[PDB]
Ligand binder design. Sequence first.
Ligand SMILES: C[C@H]1O[C@H](O[C@H]2[C@H](O)[C@@H](O)[C@@H](O[C@H]3[C@H](O)[C@@H](O)[C@@H](O[C@H]4[C@H](O)[C@@H](O)[C@@H](O[C@H]5[C@H](O)[C@@H](O)[C@@H](O)O[C@@H]5CO)O[C@@H]4CO)O[C@@H]3CO)O[C@@H]2CO)[C@H](O)[C@@H](O)[C@@H]1N[C@H]1C=C(CO)[C@@H](O)[C@H](O)[C@H]1O
Ligand SMILES: *[C@@H]1O[C@H](CO)[C@@H](O[C@@H]2O[C@H](CO)[C@@H](O)[C@H](O)[C@H]2NC(C)=O)[C@H](O[C@@H]2O[C@@H](C)[C@@H](O)[C@@H](O)[C@@H]2O)[C@H]1NC(C)=O
Ligand SMILES: *[C@@H]1O[C@H](CO)[C@@H](O)[C@H](O)[C@H]1NC(C)=O
Ligand SMILES: *[C@@H]1O[C@H](CO)[C@@H](O)[C@H](O)[C@H]1NC(C)=O
Length: 830
Amino acid sequence: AIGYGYQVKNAKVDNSTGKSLTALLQLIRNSPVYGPDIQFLSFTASFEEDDTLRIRITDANNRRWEIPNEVLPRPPPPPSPPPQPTTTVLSHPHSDLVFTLFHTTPFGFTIYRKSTHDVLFDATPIPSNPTTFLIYKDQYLQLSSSLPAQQAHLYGLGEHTKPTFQLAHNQILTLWNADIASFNRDLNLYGSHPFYMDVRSSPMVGSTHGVFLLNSNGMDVEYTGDRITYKVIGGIIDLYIFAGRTPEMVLDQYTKLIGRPAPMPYWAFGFHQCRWGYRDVNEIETVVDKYAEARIPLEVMWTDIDYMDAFKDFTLDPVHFPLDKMQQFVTKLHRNGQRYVPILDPGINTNKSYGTFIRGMQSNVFIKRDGNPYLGSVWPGPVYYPDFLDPAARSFWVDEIKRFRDILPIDGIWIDMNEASNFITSAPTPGSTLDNPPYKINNSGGRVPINSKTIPATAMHYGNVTEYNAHNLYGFLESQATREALVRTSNERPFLLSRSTFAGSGKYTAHWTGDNAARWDDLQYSIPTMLNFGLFGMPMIGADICGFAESTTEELCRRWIQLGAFYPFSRDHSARDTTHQELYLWESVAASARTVLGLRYQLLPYYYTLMYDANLRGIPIARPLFFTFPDDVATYGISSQFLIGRGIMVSPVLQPGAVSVNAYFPRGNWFSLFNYTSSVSVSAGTYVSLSAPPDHINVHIHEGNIVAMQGEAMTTQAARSTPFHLLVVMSDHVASTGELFLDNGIEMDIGGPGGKWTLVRFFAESGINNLTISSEVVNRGYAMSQRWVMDKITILGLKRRVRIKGFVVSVISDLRQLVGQAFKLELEFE
Ligand SMILES: C[C@H]1O[C@H](O[C@H]2[C@H](O)[C@@H](O)[C@@H](O[C@H]3[C@H](O)[C@@H](O)[C@@H](O[C@H]4[C@H](O)[C@@H](O)[C@@H](O[C@H]5[C@H](O)[C@@H](O)[C@@H](O)O[C@@H]5CO)O[C@@H]4CO)O[C@@H]3CO)O[C@@H]2CO)[C@H](O)[C@@H](O)[C@@H]1N[C@H]1C=C(CO)[C@@H](O)[C@H](O)[C@H]1O
Ligand SMILES: *[C@@H]1O[C@H](CO)[C@@H](O[C@@H]2O[C@H](CO)[C@@H](O)[C@H](O)[C@H]2NC(C)=O)[C@H](O[C@@H]2O[C@@H](C)[C@@H](O)[C@@H](O)[C@@H]2O)[C@H]1NC(C)=O
Ligand SMILES: *[C@@H]1O[C@H](CO)[C@@H](O)[C@H](O)[C@H]1NC(C)=O
Ligand SMILES: *[C@@H]1O[C@H](CO)[C@@H](O)[C@H](O)[C@H]1NC(C)=O
């Protein structure tokens, strides 16, 4: 059949130092299928941290493609080996993870938990079944693990649109960056994230680990419920297991490896407006004016490829978007506390009188094939693609951005079309097994050739690196270069949004779900996708509100702003061939927008703190219910509700004509953020049928949490000048806590040694006859200098009212306290 697998020829754990395991594997027998077997494998197992195990399988006899350390820096590998059945075990005393090598024919290995003896990853073959073997051919790597089908709940392996967050059994997930619209279910999309989270329902419910394959090649991942199998068309096996044991711990461990989420400027949490098709500077000015007139907050105005001179980067349409008017426009935005973001594509038009093209040629920055620059097709027509693996191309990129920024101020950059997208598929190179690989991955759901509508696999990058190997890194690399350009041309914290991504992209950029559609399905689809990118270490995520493609309806757009006002990244965007969909256009949507964006803006200090938490520990802003409630198995399959931070839950209507929603509530007390008198109390988690009128969305806060809020305003800058209102939700079972991070909104290194920041922790507890609310402050200086005052505290979750020396609501007014000054407030019961 497909292969015969490997035997352990030798294996040993180095002793008398930090243990690592080294083994040599030998091919049992050759097979012709999918090409030549690699005869000898080097096999290592090593602990990068007590909570992280690394399994690396390479050709013992040849260097193979690996993601460069410069692209994704990480600890180097453990030495390689020398030139009942037997086993070799690797364990560390402070590690919960135990690795075992089985000297069977073919060989196997497992990783199990010390605490429960539960097997997390099991690559023991079924001897009669080659689909369960490790197979290792030049263009076909096969790695398989069994799974306890009912107990293992898996999440991730992006990027794909799915109706559920938890991965359905019996499917194939393809990772191959492609310009494919996210309104398409199942298909491989713009990004590739070969990570999954595995939550176990038994034996120790809520027990979670992570599994990451550090490989940039195209792959199919087959998940059948009782097994998962990687089928990878190149590179090596570089497998990381993250011990958890909680969901939050897994993401901490994973992002520690791939990079902590980049911080975001405060303004990026404001509302964004964009459209493909804005005709001229007058129109975008008019949109901004109409937002103000509708009294709907607008933070950032975007321009799509319309602004460019005939779709060429680093230029302005001299007729529709003349430089002087654009300068005035951006100046006006800035005077009003607003910001501006333009789009960029990677392809450089081949026009001989275009400065960017001339300079690019001079520094030889473009991707080549057969010794000449590769000629693609995108919006301006013929293009060459910068090789972002080439240091000279990055410098070129920085320089073009500098030049443009010197003439027209910008606040951030949107990088699109960077898979790379190509509108003409090139002919395959005769005889090449790269353009015509032996195993066809399921590209676009049709086994479509990998070179379809992109750069051909035989194209070459700096260092003689093939497109075959580097493809999934293109977007990732451009993001690094663009961020580099921004940091070098402004001392403000940068902001960028990227379409194409790879594992680690979150260290450089925000992301959006791409080309969704104005359909009720896509409204719901935004939630699983939002949650996934949190797992992928990209917490700054959202979808085009009201839908990118196809014309929206009043009701759909109304329900969408309700949901979308809570996306970490909240933007209205649409294609040019559809109806306009600014939020002021319908009264019922505008009224809904004011209500929900009003709450969002009050929650800005909360979002910003969560962003801080994400950069620190990798924990997502928008997170699944089982992150807070991992012991409640009912939450594992929830796909239509989500948390913002630890204790706020959003429960949107996602169907037309509905005025109610059946929403799951985990155990305990929940209070509407829109009406503190409105609450939900259960002794055991269950579904509750919430009232949900056309203009309302259910948003609830759980007992045990404290959230610092500021006032509503038209801009994020204005909001920060409002008083703080503290929301304290008490629990009979636990003291309540909360956190607030404060800085200047633009410090390059968030929470760094520079000291331009303050951290406040809040604490509240009831006694039999008193109630204490207090704070602790780290680095009091910055916050004090900003004059932030807390004037009111609202207390939920008690059945008795409290004051200074069913549920009730208590309010403490005219407090005038300074946020920067630690306090202790004593209240008494009535
Ligand atoms: C504005 C955006 O324009 C482009 O994207 C467009 C396409 O150009 C357009 O044709 C269309 O494409 C859709 C199809 O309509 C839809 O049917 C689906 O195609 C599927 C197909 O259904 C499915 O069967 C499968 O086809 C296989 C088949 O399985 C197999 O057996 C065999 O037959 O082969 C076929 C074909 O390979 O897969 C198809 C997908 O490949 O989905 C496609 C979308 O992929 O709509 C899209 C989306 O609008 C550009 O590509 C986009 O990049 C562009 N959007 C960007 C541009 C901007 C402007 O600057 C910016 O505003 C946007 O934000 C940005 O995203
Ligand atoms: C090279 O870039 C030039 C600058 O943008 C292009 O010329 C401009 O084309 C606009 C329409 O695309 C037109 O409104 C502008 O007036 C014009 N500006 C100037 C200074 O010529 C040029 O476009 C080519 O030449 C024009 C005359 C048309 O024939 C276009 O169809 C051509 O593409 C660009 N040339 C190429 C080869 O890309
Ligand atoms: C707040 O909720 C309570 C209970 O659900 C309800 O009786 C009251 O009318 C609501 N108030 C407003 C202003 O909606
Ligand atoms: C609450 O506790 C404080 C300190 O323990 C005490 O001084 C005070 O008398 C108490 N209040 C009441 C109403 O008993």
